[PDB]
Each structure stands twice: as structure tokens, then as C-alpha cells.
Amino acid sequence: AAAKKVWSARRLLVLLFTPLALLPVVFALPPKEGRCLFVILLMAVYWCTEALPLSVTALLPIVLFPFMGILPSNKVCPQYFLDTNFLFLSGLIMASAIEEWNLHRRIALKILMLVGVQPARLILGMMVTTSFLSMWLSNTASTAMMLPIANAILKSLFGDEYRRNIWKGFLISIPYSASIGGTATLTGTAPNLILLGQLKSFFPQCDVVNFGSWFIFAFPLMLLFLLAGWLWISFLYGGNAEDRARAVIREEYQNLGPIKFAEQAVFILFCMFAILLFTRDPKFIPGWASLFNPGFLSDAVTGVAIVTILFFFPSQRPSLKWWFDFKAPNTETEPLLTWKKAQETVPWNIILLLGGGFAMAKGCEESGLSVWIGGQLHPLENVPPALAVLLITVVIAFFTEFASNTATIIIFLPVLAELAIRLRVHPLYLMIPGTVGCSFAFMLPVSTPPNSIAFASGHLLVKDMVRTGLLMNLMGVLLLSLAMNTWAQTIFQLGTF
Amino acid sequence: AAAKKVWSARRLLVLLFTPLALLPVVFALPPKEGRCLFVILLMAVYWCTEALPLSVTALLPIVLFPFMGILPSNKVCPQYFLDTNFLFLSGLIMASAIEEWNLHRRIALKILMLVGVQPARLILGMMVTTSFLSMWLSNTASTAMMLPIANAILKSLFGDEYRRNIWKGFLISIPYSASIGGTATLTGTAPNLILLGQLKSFFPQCDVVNFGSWFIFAFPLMLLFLLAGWLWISFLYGGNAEDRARAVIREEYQNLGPIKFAEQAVFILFCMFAILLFTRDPKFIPGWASLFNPGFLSDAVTGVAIVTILFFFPSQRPSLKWWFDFKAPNTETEPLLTWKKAQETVPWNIILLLGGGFAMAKGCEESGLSVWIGGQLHPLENVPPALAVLLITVVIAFFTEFASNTATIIIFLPVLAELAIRLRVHPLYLMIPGTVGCSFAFMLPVSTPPNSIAFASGHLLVKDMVRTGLLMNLMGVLLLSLAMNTWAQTIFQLGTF
Numbered sequence: 002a003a004a005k006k007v008w009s010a011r012r013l014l015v016l017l018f019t020p021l022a023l024l025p026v027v028f029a030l031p032p033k034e035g036r037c038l039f040v041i042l043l044m045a046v047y048w049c050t051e052a053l054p055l056s057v058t059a060l061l062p063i064v065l066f067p068f069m070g071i072l073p074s075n076k077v078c079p080q081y082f083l084d085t086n087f088l089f090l091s092g093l094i095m096a097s098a099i100e101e102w103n104l105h106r107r108i109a110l111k112i113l114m115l116v117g118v119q120p121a122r123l124i125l126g127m128m129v130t131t132s133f134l135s136m137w138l139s140n141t142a143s144t145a146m147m148l149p150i151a152n153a154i155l156k157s158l159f160g161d162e163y164r165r166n167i168w169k170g171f172l173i174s175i176p177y178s179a180s181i182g183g184t185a186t187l188t189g190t191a192p193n194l195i196l197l198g199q200l201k202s203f204f205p206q207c208d209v210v211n212f213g214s215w216f217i218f219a220f221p222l223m224l225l226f227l228l229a230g231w232l233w234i235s236f237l238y239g240g241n242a243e244d245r246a247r248a249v250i251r252e253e254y255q256n257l258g259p260i261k262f263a264e265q266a267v268f269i270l271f272c273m274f275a276i277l278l279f280t281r282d283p284k285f286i287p288g289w290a291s292l293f294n295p296g297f298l299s300d301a302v303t304g305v306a307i308v309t310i311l312f313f314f315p316s317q318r319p320s321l322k323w324w325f326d327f328k329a330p331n332t333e334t335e336p337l338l339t340w341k342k343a344q345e346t347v348p349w350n351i352i353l354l355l356g357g358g359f360a361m362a363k364g365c366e367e368s369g370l371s372v373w374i375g376g377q378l379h380p381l382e383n384v385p386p387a388l389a390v391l392l393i394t395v396v397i398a399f400f401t402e403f404a405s406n407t408a409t410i411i412i413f414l415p416v417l418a419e420l421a422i423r424l425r426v427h428p429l430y431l432m433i434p435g436t437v438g439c440s441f442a443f444m445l446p447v448s449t450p451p452n453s454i455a456f457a458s459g460h461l462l463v464k465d466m467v468r469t470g471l472l473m474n475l476m477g478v479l480l481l482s483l484a485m486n487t488w489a490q491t492i493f494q495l496g497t498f
Numbered sequence: 499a500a501a502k503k504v505w506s507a508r509r510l511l512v513l514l515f516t517p518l519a520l521l522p523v524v525f526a527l528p529p530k531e532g533r534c535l536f537v538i539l540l541m542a543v544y545w546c547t548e549a550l551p552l553s554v555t556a557l558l559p560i561v562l563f564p565f566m567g568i569l570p571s572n573k574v575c576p577q578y579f580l581d582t583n584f585l586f587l588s589g590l591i592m593a594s595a596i597e598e599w600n601l602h603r604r605i606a607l608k609i610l611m612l613v614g615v616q617p618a619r620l621i622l623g624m625m626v627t628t629s630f631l632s633m634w635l636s637n638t639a640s641t642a643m644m645l646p647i648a649n650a651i652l653k654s655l656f657g658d659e660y661r662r663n664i665w666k667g668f669l670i671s672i673p674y675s676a677s678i679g680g681t682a683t684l685t686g687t688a689p690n691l692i693l694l695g696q697l698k699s700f701f702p703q704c705d706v707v708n709f710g711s712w713f714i715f716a717f718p719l720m721l722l723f724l725l726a727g728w729l730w731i732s733f734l735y736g737g738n739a740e741d742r743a744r745a746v747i748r749e750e751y752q753n754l755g756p757i758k759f760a761e762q763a764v765f766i767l768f769c770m771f772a773i774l775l776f777t778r779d780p781k782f783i784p785g786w787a788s789l790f791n792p793g794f795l796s797d798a799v800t801g802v803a804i805v806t807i808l809f810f811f812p813s814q815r816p817s818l819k820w821w822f823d824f825k826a827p828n829t830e831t832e833p834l835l836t837w838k839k840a841q842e843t844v845p846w847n848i849i850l851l852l853g854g855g856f857a858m859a860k861g862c863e864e865s866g867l868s869v870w871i872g873g874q875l876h877p878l879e880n881v882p883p884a885l886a887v888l889l890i891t892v893v894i895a896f897f898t899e900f901a902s903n904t905a906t907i908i909i910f911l912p913v914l915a916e917l918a919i920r921l922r923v924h925p926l927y928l929m930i931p932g933t934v935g936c937s938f939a940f941m942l943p944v945s946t947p948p949n950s951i952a953f954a955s956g957h958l959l960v961k962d963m964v965r966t967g968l969l970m971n972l973m974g975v976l977l978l979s980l981a982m983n984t985w986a987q988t989i990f991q992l993g994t995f
């Protein structure tokens with residue numbers, strides 16, 4: 002009867018009744034901690050229910066922290082453009098340049114010719130390809146470059162319900178596989194570097210964690226959880242015609258024609274971007290960042306420097322004969338990427354969302370909410386450490402679904418640092434589960450910017466990724482427990498304290 | 499002969515030959531100061547020559563400051579989203595909402611009916627109206643709301659060279675008049691508040707400057723320089739037909755129809771935005787910011803809070819009968835502004851440009867370049883103070899043309915604070931000329947975000963605003979000298995030290 006009427010006004014009802022519902026939180030715990038917790042929970046609920054646009058919800062700290070006395074306006078505001086947001090923006094512009102010169106179509110056609118016209122084969126091929134792309138680039142970047150290729154693939158092989166279910170699954174596989182791929186390498190995603198820096202600050206003595214040890218630990222996790230995710234996606238979606246389809250694919254590749262100068266320039270800039278990101282500061286061999294002041298350089302500088310080249314590099318072959326040829330027309334050359342096209346194709350909503358995550362994080366530590374959470378976990382000492390770390394990674398994997406991976410790892414890592422020493426257990430035994438599990442962002446679009454990129458297409462529903470990410474998070478937590486129980490205690494020698 | 503060939507490749511030639519030309523600067527003065535000066539001059543040249551897009555040039559500090567050892571990456575990047583950038587973004591979104599509901603057309607038609615079909619009358623009317631709008635709102639905001647009205651006006655009265663010259667002049671009058679209007683009131687523009695805060699920090703004893711004194715000092719400057727600018731624009735541009743034109747104007751107003759609920763809601767949100775901005779913290783009567791922690795609240799919080807309402811407020815009249823009427827269709831209501839339309843219509847290039855200004859400013863003080871500049875001005879002591887302040891405001895008015903007003907005022911105000919004490923003159927006699935003259939941004943689009951908004955239309959040329967802003971800056975400097983010589987020495991009692 003009235004259920005349809007209530008469900009029609011879902012937005013305003015949630016907006017007006019969420020602060021009222023979360024009001025007892027403020028009175029439950031100390032004032033600043035209570036107000037910060039109220040802000041965090043309000044932001045999470047508004048993100049999950051889509052009561053406000055993700056960007057608008059991300060701007061909530063600017064209003065809430067100063068009014069509640071948590072952070073000044075001059076402190077919460079600069080958090081929205083930390084250097085990580087520049088790296089993500091530079092990756093987005095690089096992906097925009099890749100799309101704009103039809104390089105994604107060439108890559109997609111190459112993938113179809115290599116793999117074939119089989120939805121399961123194509124899904125798995127992009128799973129491994131995007132994970133490989135994510136071991137060196139950020140998850141948001143790799144997702145922003147792999148949705149163009151995936152959409153080209155779909156428009157290729159498909160030119161009823163099976164098609165559109167394949168659409169849903171074929172597009173859900175990319176952000177998930179990017180989040181999977183970010184975990185194995187320290188350079189793969191920001192939370193790994195956050196873990197390393199926080200370990201250096203908290204524990205100068207502990208130096209067993211490097212690129213090699215982290216890679217040998219987490220690559221099996223990549224393989225296992227990637228296969229598990231691929232099987233889940235395949236089962237949920239998809240369970241002389243082949244010769245004709247391959248003939249059409251080859252005809253389309255020939256219709257693409259020879260590679261243009263702009264495509265080669267964009268691809269070479271991509272290769273330089275990835276190589277400079279990886280070689281900036283490896284932890285086994287020093288990088289080129291050692292040639293300058295320590296701590297002055299980051300991945301944001303590399304990204305911005307690479308992107309700057311796209312805005313003045315010519316898109317056509319420059320010939321010295323033009324200067325001598327007075328008969329040649331005097332027209333300005335087209336750059337690789339104009340700012341107009343970039344501004345049209347850059348998702349600034351994602352930038353604002355990441356900024357909201359950073360701001361809510363800084364509010365969390367500054368208000369003392371993180372210290373309060375660490376203090377509240379004190380009675381978790383009689384509980385055996387194994388399933389204690391199990392429930393810790395469960396709650397971390399289920400809280401990273403609201404904020405970004407970077408925000409949740411910054412919020413929770415010092416809490417785990419205090420908790421591990423307080424419970425006389427090995428710190429890494431709690432350091433690593435949180436860092437890996439924060440990348441398990443699968444429920445909502447706001448969980449990670451890759452998911453927002455996925456719904457940028459419009460073929461994915463919230464309920465679908467909710468249903469998939471439930472079991473994705475479950476298997477991720479189970480494999481984290483397996484890693485902590487079998488081969489983490491020897492690689493990082495964390496089995497003895 | 500080859501002049502056309504060289505002028506064809508203006509972009510790359512400037513890009514490659516500007517660092518080479520500015521190379522001796524690094525060796526001329528101490529290393530960090532030299533590198534910072536090189537960055538500032540390179541950014542200014544690239545902005546003036548359009549060698550790179552304004553946003554791309556604004557991103558130069560992220561690459562240059564960390565590589566040159568001036569600022570760390572974690573200290574340059576957050577400068578791009580200081581709270582000044584949220585206030586401007588909120589104003590841009592508010593202007594977008596005003597445009598999206600055709601309120602600008604209603605205001606424009608009202609202006610034509612009040613004024614008449616006369617280009618000089620309309621130009622002057624918008625001069626005073628935009629100056630009035632700028633006494634309480636930021637220059638960028640008021641410009642972003644007044645270009646829509648101006649474009650509606652042009653499409654109204656005009657439906658050969660005289661038309662298009664009127665186009666140029668009619669569109670140049672808005673950003674200029676906004677920059678004029680920002681100076682008279684402390685709340686008018688950010689540099690006035692920067693002056694007040696820097697005066698409080700440097701000179702706690704000096705408290706003669708308040709809202710009333712600044713207003714009575716600078717309102718005559720508004721009137722004089724506004725009339726001078728209006729005469730210059732009129733002379734440069736523009737030097738029973740009237741009844742029929744007025745009949746068409748009235749017919750268009752009737753075609754607009756009755757004001758919709760969305761238009762009234764947007765206008766009321768505008769009024770609340772302006773009132774809350776003005777009453778947040780007046781310096782003669784305390785505002786509502788005194789109800790909270792001191793220094794926690796700013797104009798950014800007010801702007802974001804007001805803009806947040808636009809994204810969930812319904813655009814249609816909500817009736818309680820809908821709940822009882824079970825036969826009514828159950829469709830979601832349209833909000834006042836969706837995030838998609840805002841993201842389409844927000845000029846993020848302006849946000850990046852302002853961030854580049856903030857970053858280059860912080861690089862300027864951190865590297866010691868500001869202290870070096872202050873030390874170099876030591877031999878300017880035998881020169882009489884009058885024409886010394888004249889040349890000081892000349893160089894300030896001619897340097898604010900490259901960076902934003904906020905960036906240049908932050909860069910130069912501490913330098914003037916040291917210089918005034920070093921030359922045993924009244925500090926305000928140097929405080930005020932710099933603050934007012936930094937708002938004299940008239941040469942280039944990068945001089946102030948209002949100018950970028952002006953070229954957002956595309957009917958303005960660089961040479962035209964260069965030609966106009968030359969004399970605009972000249973008259974502004976002359977009137978600053980007049981104010982410093984006649985009625986500043988009594989209002990601020992700065993004639994005796």
C-alpha cells in the first residue's frame with residue numbers, strides 16, 4: 002500500500018532520519034570522539050544509500066568538522082588535494098589520452114585475436130591483464146584504462162538476457178581485478194606504501210618487509226583470489242559461427258589501419274609513466290629519487306610531469322622539411338591532448354570522493370577517535386590471536402567498503418600498531434591483514450574509485466555488485482587467514498614474538 | 499618570409515626557449531631564491547604566452563618545487579585546495595544553479611526593462627550592479643553569475659562591426675567591474691581579509707582598520723575608478739525603433755512566464771548565501787562565527803553548506819496531499835541541481851589555476867625569495883616616500899597580472915611589512931596600496947579568474963583586454979596615489995609616523 006510511497010521518497014527520508022538515528026552516538030562516547038564518529042557514520046550511510054551524490058557527501062567534512070570543533074577549515078580543506086589525488090588525476094588524464102586516440106580499440110582487438118570469442122576466456126584474460134597492470138600502477142588508473150578496452154570488446158563481439166548478463170559481469174570484472182592486483186606489490190597501491198611508512202615510523206627496528214618479501218608473500222594471494230573471483234564472476238554471469246566471428250574481428254582490426262604517430266606517442270608516454278613510477282624508489286635497489294632531497298619526490302610529481310608532456314607534444318610527425326618548404330601551409334599542430342577534452346573526460350567526482358576520504362581520516366586521528374578505538378579493543382586479549390586477527394580483518398574489509406582504501410588504512414593502521422604491542426603479539430601479524438583487507442572494496446561504488454569508474458558506464462546495478470562483493474569479501478578474508486596461518490609466519494618470521 | 503613560419507610554431511618555441519632565457523636568473527641570486535624566481539618567471543611567461551594551457555602551467559610547481567628542493571611534494575600539493583578554492587568552487591556551483599533554472603534570463607529581462615535598449619546604459623548598469631554584487635561576494639563568483647545575465651542580454655537586444663565590437667565591450671565590462679567591486683569592502687575579496695589578518699599578526703597594536711574605515715576609504719575609489727572604466731569601455735566599444743524593441747523585450751518577458759518554484763528556491767538560496775557570507779564575521783559587530791571555536795569557521799564552510807542544499811532540495815512544490823493521494827504517480831522528484839550538470843558546468847581549470855597561485859606563493863615565502871626581495875629594496879630610502887609608494891603599487895599592479903590576486907597579495911604583503919618598518923614610514927601607507935592594487939588584474943585571462951570566465955565565452959581576444967587593461971591599470975595606480983595623498987592620511991591617520 003504505502004510501501005511504494007515511502008520507497009519513492011527514499012532520498013529525503015534517509016537524509017532527515019540518519020542524523021536522528023545517529024544522535025545517540027554523540028552521547029555514547031566522549032564529545033570530540035562522539036562527534037567524529039557521528040560524522041563518519043553519517044558519511045558512510047549517505048554514501049551507501051545514495052542519499053546525496055558521492056561528491057556532495059564527500060564535501061560533508063568541510064561543513065561538519067569546523068562546526069563541531071574537530072578540525073579548523075584551514076586544516077580539513079587542504080586534505081582534498083594531498084599528492085595521492087594528483088597521482089590519481091594524472092592517471093585519469095593518461096587514460097583519457099589513451100581513449101582519445103583509439104589506442105584502446107587497438108589493444109582490445111589484439112586481445113580478441115590472442116584470446117578468441119569466448120566470454121569466459123576474455124573475462125579471465127582481462128582479469129590477469131588488469132592485475133598485471135595494477136601491480137605497477139594504481140587501481141584507479143588501471144581501471145580507468147581498462148574500462149575503455151572492455152567497452153570496445155563488448156561493442157566488438159556483440160556488435161537476449163545472456164548478452165546483458167555478460168555486460169554486467171564483463172564490466173564488474175575490471176574494478177574488482179584492479180583491487181585484487183593492487184595488493185601484491187608495494188608499488189601496486191597506496192596502502193602498501195602507507196604500511197611501509199607507518200612501519201618505518203612506528204618500528205625502526207623492524208625492517209624484514211621489503212619489495213621482495215611482500216611480493217613473494219602476496220603474489221600467491223593474487224593468484225588464489227583472482228581465480229576465486231574469476232570463477233565467481235563466470236558462474237554468476239555466463240555460467241562455423243566462431244570462424245565468422247573471428248573473420249569479423251580480423252576485418253575490424255584491418256579497418257583500424259596502421260598505427261598512427263599519436264598512438265605510438267601516447268603508448269610510449271604510458272610506458273615511461275609506468276617505468277618511472279616503478280623505478281622512482283624501489284626498496285631493494287634505490288631509485289632516481291635518491292638523486293634529490295629525501296621525501297621531496299613522490300608519485301604525484303612523476304604523474305604530473307608525464308601528463309604535462311601530453312598537452313604540448315605534437316600529434317603528427319614533425320618533419321624538418323617544413324621549415325624549408327615555404328609552400329607548406331602555416332597551421333598550428335594539434336597536441337596529443339587538449340585541456341578541453343581532458344576536462345570533459347576527467348571524473349572530478351572521484352577526486353572529490355578521495356578528498357573526502359582523506360579529510361574524514363585526518364578528522365579521525367585528530368579528534369582522538371582512533372586512540373579511543375584502540376583503547377576499546379583492550380578486552381580482546383583472552384581471545385586467541387588467530388580468530389582475533391580473523392575478526393580484525395573482517396571488520397577492516399567490511400569498513401573499507403564505505404571510504405577509500407587509503408582513508409581506511411590511514412585510520413586503522415596506527416590503531417593496529419598500538420593494539421599489537423598492547424597484546425604482546427607480532428606487529429606484522431596485524432599490520433599486513435589490515436593493509437591487504439582494506440583493498441577488498443567490493444560492495445558499493447564509493448568503496449574504491451575503480452567501482453565508481455565501473456558505474457560510470459551505467460550497465461551495473463548496486464544490488465549486483467553487492468551480491469558479488471559479499472562472497473568476494475568472504476573469500477578474501479578466508480585467504481588472508483590462510484596466508485596468516487601457513488606461509489606468513491615463515492616469510493616475515495612473524496610466528497614468534 | 500620566415501616570420502609566418504616562426505609565428506606558426508609560437509608554442510613550442512616559447513616552451514623550449516623560456517627556461518634557457520631564464521637560466522641566468524638561477525645563477526644571479528642565491529640558489530633556492532634563484533630556483534624559486536626561475537619557477538615564478540617561467541610560470542608567468544607560460545601563462546602570458548599561452549605556451550601551455552592555464553591548468554597545465556598551474557601544475558608546474560608540483561614538478562618544479564620538489565625537483566629543485568624548494569618544497570616537498572607533500573607540502574606543495576595541499577596548497578591547491580586551500581579553503582579559498584572551496585569558496586570559489588561553491589560560488590561557481592551556485593552560479594551554475596542560477597543559470598540552469600533560467601533565472602539569469604529573468605534578471606536580464608528585468609534589467610532591460612528598468613534600463614532600456616541602450617548599450618552605454620546597459621554597460622553602466624551592469625558595471626554598478628556587478629560592483630554591488632562584488633562588495634559582498636567574491637569577484638570570481640559575481641563574474642560567474644553575471645556573464646550568464648550579460649549573454650542573455652546580448653541575445654535579447656541583438657536577437658555589422660558595431661554589433662561585434664559591442665559584444666567585445668559588453669563582455670569585457672563584467673570581470674573588470676567585479677575586480678573593481680572587490681576592493682571597497684573587506685568581505686568583498688580575499689586579499690582584504692589577508693591584509694587584515696596579516697596586520698593582526700604583524701601589528702597587534704595597529705587596529706585602526708575596520709569595516710567602516712576601509713569602506714569609507716575605498717568606496718570613493720570604487721566610484722571614481724568605475725566611472726573611469728565605464729568611460730574607457732564606452733569609448734573603446736560603442737563610442738519608432740526603440741518602441742518596437744521595448745515591445746519585443748516585454749513580449750520576451752511575458753514568454754518567460756510566471757516564476758517557477760525552482761527559480762524562487764535558487765534565488766532564496768542565493769540570498770542566504772550572500773547574507774551568511776557577510777554576517778559570518780563582520781569586524782564592527784561580531785557574527786555567528788563567534789558561537790563556535792575561533793578560527794575554525796571560514797567562508798568555505800558557508801559556501802559548501804549552502805551548495806549542499808542545492809543537491810537535495812526539490813525543484814517542485816512539495817504537497818502533503820501526495821502522501822494521502824494513493825492515485826498519484828510514484829516518481830522521484832528532480833533536485834535543484836544534479837551533480838552531473840554541475841560537473842559539466844564547473845570550470846575546474848579555474849580551480850587548478852588558483853591552486854597553482856597558492857602553491858607558487860608558498861614556494862615564494864618558503865624559499866626565502868620574499869625575504870630576499872625585501873632585503874633588495876633597502877636602497878629605496880633616499881627616494882621620497884610618495885613616489886616610492888607610487889612605484890611600489892605600479893610593480894604590484896603589474897605583477898598581479900600573472901598570478902591571482904590572492905597569490906600576489908600573500909607574496910608581497912610581508913615584504914611590504916618589513917619594508918615599511920625598515921624605512922620608518924607608516925605601515926598602512928604601504929599595506930593598503932598593495933592590497934588594493936593586487937585586485938587590478940586586467941591584462942591577461944590568468945590575471946584573475948573573472949578574466950578566464952570572460953574568455954569562457956570566446957568573443958574576447960587577448961589583444962583587446964591587453965589594450966584596455968593598460969589604461970585601466972594606469973588609472974588605478976593614479977587613483978591609488980590620489981587616495982594615498984589626499985584622504986588616506988586622515989581616515990587611517992597614516993600621514994604621521
Ligand SMILES: CC(C)CCC[C@@H](C)[C@H]1CC[C@H]2[C@@H]3CC=C4C[C@@H](O)CC[C@]4(C)[C@H]3CC[C@]12C
Pocket residue numbers: 019022023024025026029046
Ligand atoms: C542509518 C541506519 C540505516 C543504520 C542504523 C543507525 C543507527 C540507528 C544505529 C547504528 C549504531 C547504533 C548505536 C550502537 C550502540 C549504542 C550504544 C548504546 O549504549 C546506546 C545506543 C547506541 C548509541 C546505538 C544507537 C543507534 C545507532 C546509532
Ligand SMILES: CC(C)CCC[C@@H](C)[C@H]1CC[C@H]2[C@@H]3CC=C4C[C@@H](O)CC[C@]4(C)[C@H]3CC[C@]12C
Pocket residue numbers: 026029030042
Ligand atoms: C556493523 C553494523 C552491525 C553496524 C554499522 C556500523 C556502526 C554504526 C557500528 C558498528 C559497531 C558499533 C559500536 C559498537 C559498540 C559501541 C560501544 C558503546 O559503548 C557505544 C557505541 C559503540 C561505539 C557502537 C557505535 C556504532 C558502531 C560503530
Ligand SMILES: CC(C)CCC[C@@H](C)[C@H]1CC[C@H]2[C@@H]3CC=C4C[C@@H](O)CC[C@]4(C)[C@H]3CC[C@]12C
Pocket residue numbers: 108111112114115130134
Ligand atoms: C601467439 C600468436 C598466435 C599471437 C601473437 C601474440 C600477441 C597477440 C600478444 C603477445 C603479447 C601480447 C601483449 C602483452 C601485454 C600487453 C599489455 C596490456 O596492457 C595490453 C595488451 C598487451 C599489449 C598484449 C597484446 C597482445 C600481445 C601482443
Ligand SMILES: CC(C)CCC[C@@H](C)[C@H]1CC[C@H]2[C@@H]3CC=C4C[C@@H](O)CC[C@]4(C)[C@H]3CC[C@]12C
Pocket residue numbers: 272273274276277280287288289291292
Ligand atoms: C626508459 C625510460 C622510461 C626512462 C627511465 C630509465 C630508468 C631505468 C633510469 C632513469 C634514471 C636512472 C637512475 C639514475 C641514478 C641512479 C643512482 C645510482 O646510484 C644508481 C642507479 C640509479 C638509481 C638509476 C637507475 C635507473 C634509472 C631509474
Ligand SMILES: CC(C)CCC[C@@H](C)[C@H]1CC[C@H]2[C@@H]3CC=C4C[C@@H](O)CC[C@]4(C)[C@H]3CC[C@]12C
Pocket residue numbers: 315317318319320321323324330332333334507510511514
Ligand atoms: C627543437 C628546435 C629545432 C626548435 C623547435 C622546433 C619546433 C617548434 C618545430 C620542429 C618541427 C616542426 C613541425 C614540422 C612539421 C609540421 C607539420 C605542419 O603542419 C606544421 C606543424 C608541424 C607539426 C611542425 C610544428 C613545429 C615543429 C615541431
Ligand SMILES: CC(C)CCC[C@@H](C)[C@H]1CC[C@H]2[C@@H]3CC=C4C[C@@H](O)CC[C@]4(C)[C@H]3CC[C@]12C
Pocket residue numbers: 038041042365370374377378379380396400412
Ligand atoms: C567508524 C570508524 C571510524 C571505525 C570503525 C567502527 C568502530 C568504531 C567499531 C567497530 C567494532 C567496534 C567494537 C566491537 C566490539 C567491542 C567489544 C566491547 O568492548 C564493546 C566495544 C568494542 C571494542 C567496539 C568498539 C567500537 C568498534 C571498534
Ligand SMILES: CC(C)CCC[C@@H](C)[C@H]1CC[C@H]2[C@@H]3CC=C4C[C@@H](O)CC[C@]4(C)[C@H]3CC[C@]12C
Pocket residue numbers: 516519520521522523526543
Ligand atoms: C621569456 C621572455 C619572453 C622575456 C625575457 C626573459 C629573459 C630573457 C630575461 C628576463 C630578466 C633577465 C635577467 C635580468 C637581470 C639579470 C642580472 C644580470 O646580472 C645577469 C642577467 C640577468 C640574470 C637577466 C638574464 C635574462 C633575463 C632572465
Ligand SMILES: CC(C)CCC[C@@H](C)[C@H]1CC[C@H]2[C@@H]3CC=C4C[C@@H](O)CC[C@]4(C)[C@H]3CC[C@]12C
Pocket residue numbers: 523526527539
Ligand atoms: C618588468 C619587465 C621589464 C621584466 C619582467 C619581470 C622579471 C623577469 C624581471 C623584473 C625585474 C628583474 C630583476 C631586477 C634586478 C635584479 C637584480 C640582479 O642582481 C639579479 C636579477 C634581478 C633579480 C632581476 C631578475 C628579473 C626581474 C625579476
Ligand SMILES: CC(C)CCC[C@@H](C)[C@H]1CC[C@H]2[C@@H]3CC=C4C[C@@H](O)CC[C@]4(C)[C@H]3CC[C@]12C
Pocket residue numbers: 605608609611612627631
Ligand atoms: C521604476 C519602475 C519603472 C520599474 C520598477 C523597478 C525594477 C525594474 C527594479 C527595482 C529594483 C531592481 C533590482 C535591484 C537589485 C537587483 C539585484 C541584482 O543582483 C540583479 C537585479 C536586481 C534584482 C534588480 C532588478 C530590477 C529591479 C527589480
Ligand SMILES: CC(C)CCC[C@@H](C)[C@H]1CC[C@H]2[C@@H]3CC=C4C[C@@H](O)CC[C@]4(C)[C@H]3CC[C@]12C
Pocket residue numbers: 769770771773774777784785786788789
Ligand atoms: C536570513 C537568513 C539568511 C539567516 C541569517 C540570519 C542572520 C541575520 C543571523 C543568523 C545567526 C545570527 C547570529 C547568532 C548569534 C549571535 C551572537 C550574539 O552575541 C550577537 C548576535 C549574533 C552574532 C547573531 C547575529 C544575526 C545572525 C548572523
Ligand SMILES: CC(C)CCC[C@@H](C)[C@H]1CC[C@H]2[C@@H]3CC=C4C[C@@H](O)CC[C@]4(C)[C@H]3CC[C@]12C
Pocket residue numbers: 010013014017812814815816817818820821827829830831
Ligand atoms: C519532513 C517529514 C514530513 C518527512 C519528509 C517528507 C518528504 C520526504 C516528502 C514531503 C512532501 C513530499 C513531496 C510531495 C509531492 C511531490 C510530487 C510527486 O511527484 C512526488 C515527489 C514530491 C516532490 C514529494 C517528495 C517527497 C516529499 C518532499
Ligand SMILES: CC(C)CCC[C@@H](C)[C@H]1CC[C@H]2[C@@H]3CC=C4C[C@@H](O)CC[C@]4(C)[C@H]3CC[C@]12C
Pocket residue numbers: 535538539862867871874875876877893897909
Ligand atoms: C617574481 C616575483 C616573485 C617578484 C616580483 C619581481 C621582483 C623579483 C623584482 C621586481 C622589481 C625588482 C627590483 C627593481 C630595482 C632594484 C634596485 C636595485 O637595488 C636592484 C635590485 C632591485 C631592488 C630589484 C630587485 C628585484 C625586484 C624586487
Ligand SMILES: CCCCCCCCCCCCCC
Pocket residue numbers: 016020027
Ligand atoms: C549540537 C548537536 C551536535 C550533534 C548533532 C549534529 C547534527 C548535524 C547534522 C548535519 C546534517 C548534514 C546533512 C543534512
Ligand SMILES: CCCCCCCCCCCCCC
Pocket residue numbers: 064068069070790803
Ligand atoms: C560545542 C560547540 C559546537 C556546537 C554545535 C555542534 C553541531 C553543529 C552543527 C552544524 C550544522 C550545520 C549545517 C549546515
Ligand SMILES: CCCCCCCCCCCCCC
Pocket residue numbers: 262265266269270310
Ligand atoms: C621507428 C619508430 C618510430 C616511432 C615514432 C613515434 C615516437 C614517439 C616518441 C614519444 C616520446 C615522448 C616523450 C618525449
Ligand SMILES: CCCCCCCCCCCCCC
Pocket residue numbers: 513517524
Ligand atoms: C640543474 C639546473 C637547475 C636550473 C634549471 C632548471 C630547468 C628546469 C626546466 C623545466 C621546464 C618545464 C617545462 C617544460
